[PDB]
Amino acid sequence: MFMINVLTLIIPILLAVAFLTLVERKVLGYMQFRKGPNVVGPYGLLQPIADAIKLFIKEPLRPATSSISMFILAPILALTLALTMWIPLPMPYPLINMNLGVLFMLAMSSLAVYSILWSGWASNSKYALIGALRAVAQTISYEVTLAIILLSVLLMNGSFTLSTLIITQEQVWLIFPAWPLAMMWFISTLAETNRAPFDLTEGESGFNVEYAAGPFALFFMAEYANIIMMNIFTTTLFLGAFHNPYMPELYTINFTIKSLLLSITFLWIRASYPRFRYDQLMHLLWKNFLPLTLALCMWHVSLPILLSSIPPQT
Amino acid sequence: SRGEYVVAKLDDLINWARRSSLWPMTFGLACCAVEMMHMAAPRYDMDRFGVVFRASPRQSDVMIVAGTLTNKMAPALRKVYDQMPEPRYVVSMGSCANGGGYYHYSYSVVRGCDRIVPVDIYVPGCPPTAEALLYGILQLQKKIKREKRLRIWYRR
Amino acid sequence: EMVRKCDPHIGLLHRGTEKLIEYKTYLQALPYFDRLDYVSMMCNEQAYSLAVEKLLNIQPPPRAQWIRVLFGEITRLLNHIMAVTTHALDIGAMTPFFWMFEEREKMFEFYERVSGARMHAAYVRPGGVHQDLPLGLMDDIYEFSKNFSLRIDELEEMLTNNRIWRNRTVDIGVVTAEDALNYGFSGVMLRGSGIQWDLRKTQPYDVYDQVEFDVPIGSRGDCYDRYLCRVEEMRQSIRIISQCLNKMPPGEIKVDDAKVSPPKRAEMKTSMESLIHHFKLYTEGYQVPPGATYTAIEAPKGEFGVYLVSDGSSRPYRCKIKAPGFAHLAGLDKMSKGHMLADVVAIIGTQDIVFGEVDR
Amino acid sequence: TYKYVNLREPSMDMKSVTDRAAQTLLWTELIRGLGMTLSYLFREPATINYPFEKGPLSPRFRGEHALRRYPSGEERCIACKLCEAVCPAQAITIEAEPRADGSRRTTRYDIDMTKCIYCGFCQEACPVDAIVEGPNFEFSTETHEELLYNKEKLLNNGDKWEAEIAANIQADYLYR
Amino acid sequence: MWFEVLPGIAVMGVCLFIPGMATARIHRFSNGGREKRVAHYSYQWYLMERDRRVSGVNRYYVSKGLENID
Amino acid sequence: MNLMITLLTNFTLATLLVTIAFWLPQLNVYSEKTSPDPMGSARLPFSMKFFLVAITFLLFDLEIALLLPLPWASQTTNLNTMLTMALLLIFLLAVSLAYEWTQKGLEWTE
Amino acid sequence: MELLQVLKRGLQQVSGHGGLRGYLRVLFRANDVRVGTLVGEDKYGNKYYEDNKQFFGRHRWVIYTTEMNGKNTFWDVDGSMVPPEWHRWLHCMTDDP
Amino acid sequence: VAAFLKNVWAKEPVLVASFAIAGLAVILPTLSPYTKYSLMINRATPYNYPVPLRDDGNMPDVPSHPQDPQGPSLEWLKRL
Numbered sequence A: 001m002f003m004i005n006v007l008t009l010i011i012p013i014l015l016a017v018a019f020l021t022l023v024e025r026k027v028l029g030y031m032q033f034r035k036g037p038n039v040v041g042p043y044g045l046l047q048p049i050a051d052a053i054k055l056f057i058k059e060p061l062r063p064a065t066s067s068i069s070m071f072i073l074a075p076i077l078a079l080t081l082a083l084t085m086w087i088p089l090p091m092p093y094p095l096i097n098m099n100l101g102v103l104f105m106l107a108m109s110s111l112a113v114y115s116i117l118w119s120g121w122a123s124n125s126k127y128a129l130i131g132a133l134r135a136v137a138q139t140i141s142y143e144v145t146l147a148i149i150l151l152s153v154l155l156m157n158g159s160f161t162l163s164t165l166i167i168t169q170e171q172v173w174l175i176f177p178a179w180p181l182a183m184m185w186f187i188s189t190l191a192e193t194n195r196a197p198f199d200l201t202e203g204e205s206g207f208n209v210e211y212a213a214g215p216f217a218l219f220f221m222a223e224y225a226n227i228i229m230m231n232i233f234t235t236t237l238f239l240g241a242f243h244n245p246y247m248p249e250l251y252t253i254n255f256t257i258k259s260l261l262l263s264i265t266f267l268w269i270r271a272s273y274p275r276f277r278y279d280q281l282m283h284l285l286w287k288n289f290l291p292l293t294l295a296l297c298m299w300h301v302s303l304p305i306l307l308s309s310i311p312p313q314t
Numbered sequence B: 001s002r003g004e005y006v007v008a009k010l011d012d013l014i015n016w017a018r019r020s021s022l023w024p025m026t027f028g029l030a031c032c033a034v035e036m037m038h039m040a041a042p043r044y045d046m047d048r049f050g051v052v053f054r055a056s057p058r059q060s061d062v063m064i065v066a067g068t069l070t071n072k073m074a075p076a077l078r079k080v081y082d083q084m085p086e087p088r089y090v091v092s093m094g095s096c097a098n099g100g101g102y103y104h105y106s107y108s109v110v111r112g113c114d115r116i117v118p119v120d121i122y123v124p125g126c127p128p129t130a131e132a133l134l135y136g137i138l139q140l141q142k143k144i145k146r147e148k149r150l151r152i153w154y155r156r
Numbered sequence C: 001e002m003v004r005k006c007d008p009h010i011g012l013l014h015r016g017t018e019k020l021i022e023y024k025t026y027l028q029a030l031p032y033f034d035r036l037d038y039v040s041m042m043c044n045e046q047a048y049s050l051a052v053e054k055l056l057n058i059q060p061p062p063r064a065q066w067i068r069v070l071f072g073e074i075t076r077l078l079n080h081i082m083a084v085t086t087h088a089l090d091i092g093a094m095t096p097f098f099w100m101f102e103e104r105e106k107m108f109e110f111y112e113r114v115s116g117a118r119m120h121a122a123y124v125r126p127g128g129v130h131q132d133l134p135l136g137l138m139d140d141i142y143e144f145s146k147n148f149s150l151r152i153d154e155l156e157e158m159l160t161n162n163r164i165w166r167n168r169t170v171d172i173g174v175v176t177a178e179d180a181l182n183y184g185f186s187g188v189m190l191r192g193s194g195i196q197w198d199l200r201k202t203q204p205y206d207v208y209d210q211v212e213f214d215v216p217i218g219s220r221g222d223c224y225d226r227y228l229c230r231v232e233e234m235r236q237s238i239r240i241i242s243q244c245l246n247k248m249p250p251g252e253i254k255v256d257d258a259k260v261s262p263p264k265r266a267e268m269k270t271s272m273e274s275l276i277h278h279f280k281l282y283t284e285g286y287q288v289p290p291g292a293t294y295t296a297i298e299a300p301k302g303e304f305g306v307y308l309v310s311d312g313s314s315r316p317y318r319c320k321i322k323a324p325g326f327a328h329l330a331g332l333d334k335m336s337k338g339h340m341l342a343d344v345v346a347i348i349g350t351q352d353i354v355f356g357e358v359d360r
Numbered sequence D: 001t002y003k004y005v006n007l008r009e010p011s012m013d014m015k016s017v018t019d020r021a022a023q024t025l026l027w028t029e030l031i032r033g034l035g036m037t038l039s040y041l042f043r044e045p046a047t048i049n050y051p052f053e054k055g056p057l058s059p060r061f062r063g064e065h066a067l068r069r070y071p072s073g074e075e076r077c078i079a080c081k082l083c084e085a086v087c088p089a090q091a092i093t094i095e096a097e098p099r100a101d102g103s104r105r106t107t108r109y110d111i112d113m114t115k116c117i118y119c120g121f122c123q124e125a126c127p128v129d130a131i132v133e134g135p136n137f138e139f140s141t142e143t144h145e146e147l148l149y150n151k152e153k154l155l156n157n158g159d160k161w162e163a164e165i166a167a168n169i170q171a172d173y174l175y176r
Numbered sequence E: 001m002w003f004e005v006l007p008g009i010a011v012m013g014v015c016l017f018i019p020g021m022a023t024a025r026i027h028r029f030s031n032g033g034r035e036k037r038v039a040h041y042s043y044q045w046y047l048m049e050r051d052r053r054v055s056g057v058n059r060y061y062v063s064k065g066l067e068n069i070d
Numbered sequence F: 001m002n003l004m005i006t007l008l009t010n011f012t013l014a015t016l017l018v019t020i021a022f023w024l025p026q027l028n029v030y031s032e033k034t035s036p037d038p039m040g041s042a043r044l045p046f047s048m049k050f051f052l053v054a055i056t057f058l059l060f061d062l063e064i065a066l067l068l069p070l071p072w073a074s075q076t077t078n079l080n081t082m083l084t085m086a087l088l089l090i091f092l093l094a095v096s097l098a099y100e101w102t103q104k105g106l107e108w109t110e
Numbered sequence G: 001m002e003l004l005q006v007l008k009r010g011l012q013q014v015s016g017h018g019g020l021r022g023y024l025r026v027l028f029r030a031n032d033v034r035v036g037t038l039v040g041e042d043k044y045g046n047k048y049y050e051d052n053k054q055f056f057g058r059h060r061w062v063i064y065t066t067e068m069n070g071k072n073t074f075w076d077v078d079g080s081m082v083p084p085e086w087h088r089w090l091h092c093m094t095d096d097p
Numbered sequence H: 001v002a003a004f005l006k007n008v009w010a011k012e013p014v015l016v017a018s019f020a021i022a023g024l025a026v027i028l029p030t031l032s033p034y035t036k037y038s039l040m041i042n043r044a045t046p047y048n049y050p051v052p053l054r055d056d057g058n059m060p061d062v063p064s065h066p067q068d069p070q071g072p073s074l075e076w077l078k079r080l
């Protein structure tokens, strides 16, 4: 019965990632004064299916790899981590209810740079390796503000428990006491997933260009699973919905609408801005987000003490 | 028979998925690049056909040779063609890619890109309009729709 | 991260255009100029036409000159839409590309209504223009111009005060005025450096001394002031188009010398002299008196010049083509030093470089 | 007669400095750009439904070539080779002879459509309106030599498109 | 117009609605019509194992009330 | 236990999709390809700056590891000492960032 | 409320194509369900429609025949299927069909 | 002390906000009247069992029952 619950988690993940590609092409279409796909299916609803079947019978690109083993391991690690980030998510009840789910997600997202690094070294292109090193340095840079912002928010929660974060936000959204943390958090999640305006793997080579159409599609769907997941996590973390315990589907509808709007906000940010130069988002992290993040971490340490608003441990 | 019916339906499925998800790599060589950009512009909008705008050359399905092919760039064209995964198609757009065009008798122009790469659709014009190029892309989709890969495989 | 040396290898679109001009007549060599700066077609037509008309010692009629200035500024809108939106597209701002190519599609409809082709019109000829404006064209040019300032305003909303766009342009590619003059820069490449120079003002051609407009001048010599100069040149092109639509005169559109411009088809089929002149202008062509001119216009990329040498025959002996992008891409190596690799694509964008005119 | 783009000194009073700092810390122009992108989201797109909806053309449009006839069936081309003399790409190849009724007619009228620059100098050099460049732009082929039209193909394009070509010439002949 | 993107958003939203609805119904099916017992701390697990021992059917969720005493 | 089952299911589905993506188009018989990069054969030049930003990540990540028990440490009854040491750790992370600034360590990847 | 008028226009687009069957026919062939004034029909079965409230480019269209010159064109519609007398009207070279 | 402050707020508003929020976090808990209640609530939270005292006979402040008057109270927490 638990295996049914695991499958009803992870097969809808793959379906939502499949149709997120359609939603991105359509929304980026209408924001660019054109249409998106509307020929292949009715309203383009068969475009992800057609594209999956196209990519899974395309010729293998057949690279000469420096390592065969890490070239196999990098998509496996990417998909495994992108599927295990979902299991503590309280929506309203997590699959795995763990006491330290926030730190679990921070750890499993910190492990996601090995897929980039191993795929960059497993290619024989030196320029692909340079791009992989830039992508890893970007991701580990923004993980610093992820961890410190996330700590500063959970100083209002009381624990690392993700389900407690719903109880924390029953009277007000947590974006009201922590909107500067929310906006630096949101741009840091935008820079974690290598999402525009932080997508330098498409700014003028990607780390995974030596993969065939199948494995590059697996990297791509792990990336969009990370995108939907971080939007759900940001929704749980700052926009926590009403939860009637006798009617859990009210919370499920509410966090689903908010997470969809936040994923469309990712789609709407990539339809609006040019890219950063690489040093410019390094400047954005180290010289702008990190001093404010340390200052607000001092503020959110000292603030529950000075107002007598320390959250409970349990 | 059953096997002929099964390979016919699988041919229809894989031809549908290939012609409905064509990814182009456009050699924006010369003035035909401007008109390929108009075929991507919101009036015609290739992206609603499933034809994405500027896929990378190692994942694209069709090479649109849009412009004049000179002698100095013909090995680069052929190298990008050899780096494309199969099934790869070639749309020749406009007169210089088709036959040399207005620079046919030049010392430095390849007289049509079909001296360099095999070509599927010849799209005529100087430039052909964006609507004429979109006509050529839909004709390429119709050419993919009547492919018989698995039927010939079953009959061999 | 820094760039020490940038060596642009070109000739990938060298077509031997101006050797092919030597084996063709003057009317036959006119459509090569549509294909040099292939976003600025009728302007290069105008530069070649002014060169041949200077060597022929004839002048276009006034309505032909107003049609040439009208379509030159429509062409300038085409080229600066191409310039600004691809310069933003290569940096990452992909959305005003699609927002402005619908307006660019409508100006290609203007070209197609007046000539029959959307891009390579062969419309501005030595002697005037090929054919008169069809009825209702000026109404639709007015309907375009009445709304196009809002399109510039929302482009300028998306880019100008955007801090990501200002980080990618403000201290990038700084060119001094003396180095821009020494490197043969022209147009916006001079005008971002604060040099007050514009060939429509200083060395005016067809009726540009009769239209009223302003020249946008930069202050810092960078990518960002050149962006602002191109946006403001789209503004001033809308201004000149309004002045051309109001001050369009009646009359003929070819010069009324039928030994230079071909006669009308009604009188080609009626008059003996007109049939002879139609015959000889479409088989031999007109003879151009011997001499060498360097005729330059203010194309939307800068000074576009033709050094045309005639020997007295109906075919050009020599036609050297000065493109702005040739000297601009030569100065790319100086403009890219002390910058990063991602700045190089922005400097290649701020120099408006179309390789058809760069390579010929 | 000139203007200065970007020669503004920003005001240094506390009001304007706090305006610029609220812009820096609260991302006001970034919300402006998101607003303009959201504004195009709710517009009707400019996308026509090709092939069922077509781009607007004029009667001057220069597409596929056609040899025309008189209103008696006699072909208009009297073999004068003006079109191939003016042809800037040398796409037109003409051979002629007197035929059985002594008329001056072609035995070869070839147009290489892959040399052709579609500029229509042939249809304006033509004294009898024989060669025209008609309104067809949807004639893409699968083979290169299918774009090498001989006299039979061009006369068949004339017979195919004449009902449209005559009306386009009827619209535009008073400008020519 | 813009509402053409809403079918894909609807499909994706149903696909995001499925996991939480599924785990809520599976938790109510596996735990006697109630929520799953949250045992983050060893006292909660002690009470839960005591419930499993006092139920007599080796199921923690089968609750025994005042009817189980005299 | 349910966590180990879920990890095994996620890893098995990932390995199955990777096996399908590496071996479903291998069944085709397409063609043998001869096939004879911005740098040609020059050895990868070392960047000191990428190493410095990775080490700065590592040291700030250790300081983050010290900062991680604060939502538990706020529950103590020695709150003046706890608040003093929390502000002292975040201040020493800020002093590390300031020294990384002022000796030009955050330059050309600022 | 004006959303009710939008829903009524959608339902009368379903009604205008002759029911749900003709609605789905034109949806899967045209990728387009708006109704127009039937301007005419050629000798092949192509049906030519106006709608002058649509913008310039959408205001004239053709629903192609399902069989032309022996070829099944139910799914294989083609821009060259338009005869020349309707090719001036459809491409807006004239106001007159 | 005022021209330098407007200068750094014009040039570097991120860092001015950073040092200002950090200064408030430093100085404001010493000026707050509610810092005392944080301590009082953390000591009012009964994690352990209240191990009772052997009644020697003379302990007037220790109750015999939870509902007795003597002993530590939490009226301040319910009221605040």
Ligand SMILES: CCCCCCCCCCCCCCCCCC(=O)OC[C@H](COP(=O)([O-])OCC[N+](C)(C)C)OC(=O)CCCCCCCCCCCCCCCCC
Pocket: A180, A182, A183, A184, A186, A187, A197, A234, A238, A269, A273, A284, A287, A288, A289, A292, C163, D024, D025, D026, D027, D030, D031, H011, H012, H014, H016, H017, H020, H021
């Ligand atoms: C979670 C739901 C969504 C959350 C909100 C996010 C929605 C909006 C997103 C818009 C699209 C953004 C795309 C990416 C943008 C990247 C660029 C960018 O913005 O860079 C950040 C910019 C960078 O600025 P910059 O780099 O342009 O500035 C120049 C900086 N120097 C001089 C160093 C070169 O700003 C920040 O870093 C600010 C981050 C947030 C700060 C929040 C401060 C709150 C107020 C604190 C108190 C202030 C008063 C003082 C104390 C008073 C005490 C009483």
Ligand SMILES: CCCCCCCCCCCCCCCCCC(=O)OC[C@H](COP(=O)(O)OCCN)OC(=O)CCCCCCCCCCCCCCCCC
Pocket: A015, A041, A042, A045, A046, E011, E014, E015, G028, G074
């Ligand atoms: C959580 C929800 C998730 C939902 C995911 C899916 C979203 C999109 C749903 C589908 C949308 C509509 C699909 C319509 C498909 C096209 C049908 C069609 O018309 O096919 C025509 C084609 C040829 O027909 P023919 O008979 O030749 O025509 C000549 C007639 N004189 O005939 C054929 O091609 C043969 C028939 C093909 C039918 C394919 C149907 C679509 C497959 C969808 C798969 C997913 C279904 C939902 C799964 C989740 C719910 C269980």
Ligand SMILES: CCCCCCCCCCCCCCCCCC(=O)OC[C@H](COP(=O)(O)OCCN)OC(=O)CCCCCCCCCCCCCCCCC
Pocket: A018, A039, A040, A046, A048, A049, A050, A052, A053, B006, B009, B010, B012, B013, B016, B145, G028, G029, G075, G076, G077
């Ligand atoms: C034993 C017998 C069976 C043997 C094995 C076959 C298994 C089933 C495979 C699918 C059904 C077989 C037929 C496939 C389609 C054939 C018909 C076809 O191509 O119809 C064309 C029609 C659209 O017409 P079109 O040519 O595109 O015209 C353009 C518009 N002017 O096209 C349409 O209307 C849409 C066609 C959609 C095709 C089916 C839907 C996609 C496939 C779904 C199942 C597989 C993938 C599952 C999910 C993968 C991961 C996302």
Ligand SMILES: CCCCCCCCCCCCCCCCCC(=O)OC[C@H](COP(=O)(O)OCCN)OC(=O)CCCCCCCCCCCCCCCCC
Pocket: A073, A076, A077, A080, A081, A084, A097, A098, A099, A100, A101, A104, E039, E040, E041, F001, F003, F004, F007, F011
């Ligand atoms: C290259 C190799 C292959 C790469 C791809 C696959 C590996 C990477 C992706 C998967 C990563 C596995 C992570 C496993 C541990 C995660 C941490 C963890 O267990 O946290 C959850 C929870 C802690 O919370 P708490 O509620 O306090 O504990 C329960 C108390 N009621 O604690 C629990 O619930 C405890 C449950 C029992 C203990 C579980 C032990 C798991 C098995 C050992 C580690 C497996 C991974 C080894 C390889 C790592 C990557 C190389």
Ligand SMILES: CCCCCCCCCCCCCCCCCC(=O)OC[C@H](COP(=O)(O)OCCN)OC(=O)CCCCCCCCCCCCCCCCC
Pocket: A290, A291, A292, A294, A295, F091, F094, F095, F097, F098, F101, H008, H012, H015, H016, H017, H018, H019, H020, H021, H022, H023, H024, H026
């Ligand atoms: C006491 C409380 C705790 C304080 C420590 C904790 C702070 C939390 C935030 C952490 C910040 C870590 C990094 C700080 C580095 C400071 C040095 C620095 O950045 O100097 C360089 C800078 C000029 O920048 P530049 O080198 O040109 O870089 C390119 C960008 N233009 O130079 C400058 O911009 C000048 C910066 C100094 C002046 C800032 C004044 C802010 C005043 C706010 C009001 C007072 C708040 C109370 C605290 C006292 C502040 C002096």
Ligand SMILES: CCCCCCCCCCC1=C(C)C(=O)C(OC)=C(OC)C1=O
Pocket: A014, A017, A018, A019, A021, A022, A048, A049, A051, A052, A055, A216, A217, A220, A221, B052, B059, F017
């Ligand atoms: C298990 C496999 C599920 C289906 C595959 C993922 C869903 C389809 C995504 C298709 C796709 C789109 C639209 C796409 O645009 C794209 O290019 C950026 C891809 O990467 C190569 C894609 O994979």
Ligand code: SF4
Pocket: B030, B031, B032, B033, B066, B067, B068, B093, B094, B095, B096, B097, B101, B102, B125, B126, B127, B128, C035, C038, C120
């Ligand atoms: S066919 Fe014509 S317009 Fe096209 S690239 Fe060639 S010269 Fe330019």
Ligand code: SF4
Pocket: D083, D086, D087, D088, D089, D090, D091, D092, D111, D115, D116, D117, D118, D119, D120, D121, D122, D123, D133
């Ligand atoms: S359109 Fe021009 S290039 Fe083509 S055949 Fe006529 S004259 Fe020659």
Ligand code: SF4
Pocket: D076, D077, D078, D079, D080, D081, D082, D083, D084, D094, D122, D125, D126, D127, D128, D129, D130, D131
């Ligand atoms: S088509 Fe016209 S110009 Fe050409 S040979 Fe015939 S009559 Fe002369």
